[PDB]
Amino acid sequence: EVLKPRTLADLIRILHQLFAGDEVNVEEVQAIMEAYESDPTEWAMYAKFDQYRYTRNLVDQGNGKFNLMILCWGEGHGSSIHDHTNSHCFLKMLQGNLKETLFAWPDKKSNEMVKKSERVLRENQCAYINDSVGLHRVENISHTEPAVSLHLYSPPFDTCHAFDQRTGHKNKVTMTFHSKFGIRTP
Ligand SMILES: [Fe+2]
């Protein structure tokens, strides 16, 4: 009964509609992102990897309502523990598998951070997080295979915080794009 996009372009078009309003039904968006069957022929143009770090590849700016980007995780690549700057954040697997570790928020006291959940995102699965849910970190589970994920952030944002797992202390980080619309950035 979920509206099923048949192509990445269908999905983007549906997303333009679901985020046209002031209200966003989170479960609705999650189910539609998940219903799209990852087709590498459709997103290979965005699948630009790097030897040492994961890459952020902009796909669509969602008429100022969201960023839709593709993240390419090389062998063993992972993120830091990070927050999401008060936005809705949807994460769908396109290839491979990411381990998501949910953390609790630190307070002012220095302390080892606390895991609240640990899971593997399956093929085509769409996960969701926001700041009230927790912090998280994502990691390619594989040291022999890449992972590719599709991310929708609403409203868009280009700064967040990274957290040190040993203490909980945090630093501001400016996110950069490795490529936009299939074109490498400077
Ligand atoms: Fe994230």
Residue 137 is encoded by which pair of tokens?
């970190």
Burial label for 159, CB within 10 Å (0-12, 13-18, 19+), is exposed
The contacts of residue 17 (CB under 8 Å, 6+ apart) are none
Take residue 61 and report the two structure tokens written for it.
Answer: 């700016």
Domains of the chain in start order, with CATH, are 1-186 (2.60.120.10)
Place of tokens 């509609």: 17
Find all residues with CB under 8 Å of 154, minimum gap 6, and list them: 19, 24, 62, 65, 66, 67, 87, 88
Binding-site residues for Fe cation sit at 82, 84, 136
- Residues 80, 164: contact at Cβ < 8 Å? no
Of 161, 147, 173, 175, nearest to 58 by C-alpha is 175
The two structure tokens encoding residue 38: 């990852």
Residues 57, 102, 20, 94, CA torsion sign: positive
DSSP H or E stretch at residue 138: strand 135-140
- Structural method: X-ray
Distance CA 158, CA 139 (A): 20
> Which residues, in sequence order, are CB contacts of 116 under 8 Å at separation 6+?
102, 103, 104, 134
Only one residue has tokens 């009964």, namely 1
Distance 83 CA to ligand 1 centre (A): 7
Q: What is the distance in A from the centroid of ligand 1 to the CA of 153?
A: 9
Resolution in A: 2.4
Do 67 and 153 touch, CB atoms closer than 8 A?
yes
Rounded Cα distance, 79 and 69, in Å: 15
Handedness of CA 143, 120, 67, 13 (dihedral sign): positive
Give the whole-angstrom CA distance, residue 186 versus residue 145.
27
Ligand 1 centroid – CA 137 distance (Å): 7
